[PDB]
């Protein structure tokens, strides 16, 4: 009433960078107000849940100025550059994120007291102009990466603490003799997480697509197998589903079936015939 639901893209206990969605005071600079309840010390120690800390240094301040083009300039206080050097990555893609989360902007352009950010100031970073969901987040960097064989896509992998069940989403490599990036976010989702990542996946590995996907004015429809599941989906499995591929370029819904037809149900039982869509709030936080 007073408040309303905003992601914000904190830090989990295991350094993953993390949807939290939190009741904001209604505001006139919403995109502003997002990037304010990031800063550690600040509005949001009063809402933090449970096993994740906030991602800005205490006391800086920000500007945002939001262009026709989709550009979201954030403009910091000095206090931005008071981080440790290992949190450099997750603080560009916290922001990143934050930002993006709004329909007037889908990239960001950093700076600290108008000065343009071509690399991050601690550690050297580099930042891209087009700055985008599209840059990733919690990147693999495990084992040797050949990033002239493969692409990036980002995959939600299941997290717990004592509060709650959230979806951290992964950005893995993917080769690129896969031309079809929905069967490879299923296959992905069914190999499931690095081991002793903190992550786990409620997909059994057997999990395959039994017809190539099929796109139609946004909607994607999976035909899966036995393995997927009375025949219940568990949600967990499906918010994965949904989440990792609604984060593709024109993905808005997802249809799902099993060997051809119609026949899944969710955990309450109930038939799902129609396209399933984006959850319209990722994470809601317990605090």
Same mark, same amino acid.
Do not use: C
């Given at each position: 009433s007073s408040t309303v639901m905003r992601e914000l893209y904190l830090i989990d206990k295991n350094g993953y960078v993390v949807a939290q969605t939190l009741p904001l005071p209604k505001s006139e600079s919403t995109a502003k107000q997002a990037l304010e309840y990031?800063? $550690?010390?600040?509005?949001v120690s009063e809402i933090l849940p449970n096993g994740f800390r906030a991602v800005l240094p205490a006391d800086t301040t920000v500007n945002v100025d939001i262009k026709k083009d989709g550009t979201a &300039?954030?403009?910091f206080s000095n206090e931005f550059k008071n981080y440790k050097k290992e949190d450099e990555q997750k603080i560009v893609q916290s922001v990143t994120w934050t930002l993006t $989360?709004?329909?007037? &902007?889908?990239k960001v352009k950093l700076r600290i007291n108008g000065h343009e950010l071509k690399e991050m100031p601690v550690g050297g970073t580099p930042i891209s102009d087009d700055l985008s969901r599209k840059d990733g987040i919690n990147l693999e960097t495990a084992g040797v990466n050949d990033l002239t064989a493969t692409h990036p896509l980002t995959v939600y992998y299941l997290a717990e603490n004592e509060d709650s069940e959230y979806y951290v989403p992964v950005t893995k490599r993917i080769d690129n003799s896969e031309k079809d990036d929905i069967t490879a976010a299923i296959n992905e989702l069914a190999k499931g997480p690095s081991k002793v990542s903190g992550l786990l996946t409620d997909?059994?590995?057997d999990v395959k697509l039994v017809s190539k996907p099929k796109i139609?004015?946004?909607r994607v429809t999976l035909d899966f197998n036995q393995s &997927?599941? @009375?025949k219940m989906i568990s949600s967990e499995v499906l918010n994965s589903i949904v989440? @990792?591929?609604t984060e593709q370029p024109d993905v808005k819904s997802v249809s799902v079936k099993v060997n051809g037809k119609s026949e899944l149900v969710n955990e309450k039982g109930e038939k799902l015939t129609e396209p399933v869509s984006r959850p319209s709030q990722v994470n809601t936080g317990s605090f």
């Amino acid at each position: 009433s007073s408040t309303v639901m905003r992601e914000l893209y904190l830090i989990d206990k295991n350094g993953y960078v993390v949807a939290q969605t939190l009741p904001l005071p209604k505001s006139e600079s919403t995109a502003k107000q997002a990037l304010e309840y990031l800063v $550690q010390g600040g509005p949001v120690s009063e809402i933090l849940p449970n096993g994740f800390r906030a991602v800005l240094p205490a006391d800086t301040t920000v500007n945002v100025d939001i262009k026709k083009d989709g550009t979201a &300039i954030a403009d910091f206080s000095n206090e931005f550059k008071n981080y440790k050097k290992e949190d450099e990555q997750k603080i560009v893609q916290s922001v990143t994120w934050t930002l993006t $989360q709004f329909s007037s &902007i889908d990239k960001v352009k950093l700076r600290i007291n108008g000065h343009e950010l071509k690399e991050m100031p601690v550690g050297g970073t580099p930042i891209s102009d087009d700055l985008s969901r599209k840059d990733g987040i919690n990147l693999e960097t495990a084992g040797v990466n050949d990033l002239t064989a493969t692409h990036p896509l980002t995959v939600y992998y299941l997290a717990e603490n004592e509060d709650s069940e959230y979806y951290v989403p992964v950005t893995k490599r993917i080769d690129n003799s896969e031309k079809d990036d929905i069967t490879a976010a299923i296959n992905e989702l069914a190999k499931g997480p690095s081991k002793v990542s903190g992550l786990l996946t409620d997909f059994s590995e057997d999990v395959k697509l039994v017809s190539k996907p099929k796109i139609k004015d946004g909607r994607v429809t999976l035909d899966f197998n036995q393995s &997927i599941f @009375t025949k219940m989906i568990s949600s967990e499995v499906l918010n994965s589903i949904v989440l @990792t591929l609604t984060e593709q370029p024109d993905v808005k819904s997802v249809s799902v079936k099993v060997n051809g037809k119609s026949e899944l149900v969710n955990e309450k039982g109930e038939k799902l015939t129609e396209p399933v869509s984006r959850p319209s709030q990722v994470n809601t936080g317990s605090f």
